[PDB]
Amino acid sequence: MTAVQLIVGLGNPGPEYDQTRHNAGALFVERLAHAQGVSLVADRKYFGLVGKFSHQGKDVRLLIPTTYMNRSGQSVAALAGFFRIAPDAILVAHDELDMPPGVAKLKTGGGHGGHNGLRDIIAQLGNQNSFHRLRLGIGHPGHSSLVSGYVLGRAPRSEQELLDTSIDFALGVLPEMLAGDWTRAMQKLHSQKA
Numbered sequence: 001m002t003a004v005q006l007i008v009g010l011g012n013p014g015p016e017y018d019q020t021r022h023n024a025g026a027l028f029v030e031r032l033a034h035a036q037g038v039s040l041v042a043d044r045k046y047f048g049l050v051g052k053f054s055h056q057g058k059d060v061r062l063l064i065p066t067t068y069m070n071r072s073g074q075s076v077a078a079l080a081g082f083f084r085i086a087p088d089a090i091l092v093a094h095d096e097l098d099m100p101p102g103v104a105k106l107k108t109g110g111g112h113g114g115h116n117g118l119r120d121i122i123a124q125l126g127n128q129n130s131f132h133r134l135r136l137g138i139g140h141p142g143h144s145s146l147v148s149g150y151v152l153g154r155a156p157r158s159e160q161e162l163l164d165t166s167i168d169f170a171l172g173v174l175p176e177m178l179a180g181d182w183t184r185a186m187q188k189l190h191s192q193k194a
């Protein structure tokens with residue numbers, strides 16, 4: 001019943017970080033923007049790359065923060081505040097350690113699960129965790145101590161391919177996502193194998 005008005009894709013700015021696992025979410029928004037013919041404009045007042053397309057009479061915005069992963073919320077808060085977009089009208093695409101590559105899932109509310117981008121968005125939205133997430137699986141190296149080095153790595157070829165497959169699966173269910181029909185979106189998404 002609540003239509004999506006902001007899609008955020010999380011990532012780190014700069015060449016050293018391009019195409020790393022931690023940029024899965026920004027990759028998703030980048031594919032979305034290309035599929036829709038939407039230009040991503042560098043806008044200083046939103047600390048990121050911003051885009052716009054129309055859907056059912058409403059303005060749907062795309063956002064890739066150009067702050068570091070850990071200050072993403074200042075970008076999300078800046079755009080959500082200017083346009084009075086409530087938490088539940090926001091979708092955040094992000095890498096997910098808890099699912100292997102090729103798998104993508106939707107979720108409404110909850111923890112930040114250790115993810116520093118998510119954590120900053122929950123914090124900056126005046127502690128609202130109410131938003132929806134597209135969790136794009138990237139695997140887990142095996143030990144908590146390895147996590148930092150792993151998300152900042154470029155995945156091997158087979159894994160980048162499975163990521164691409166899952167992003168494609170997730171663009172498949174865009175109509176349902178934009179509409180706010182989360183159960184239908186889940187049913188369709190959560191049944192596809194890479």
Ligand SMILES: O=C(O)CCCCC(=O)O
Binds near residue numbers: 095096097115117
């Ligand atoms: O939680 C994840 O899926 C991986 C991100 C690692 C946590 C971080 O963003 O600080």
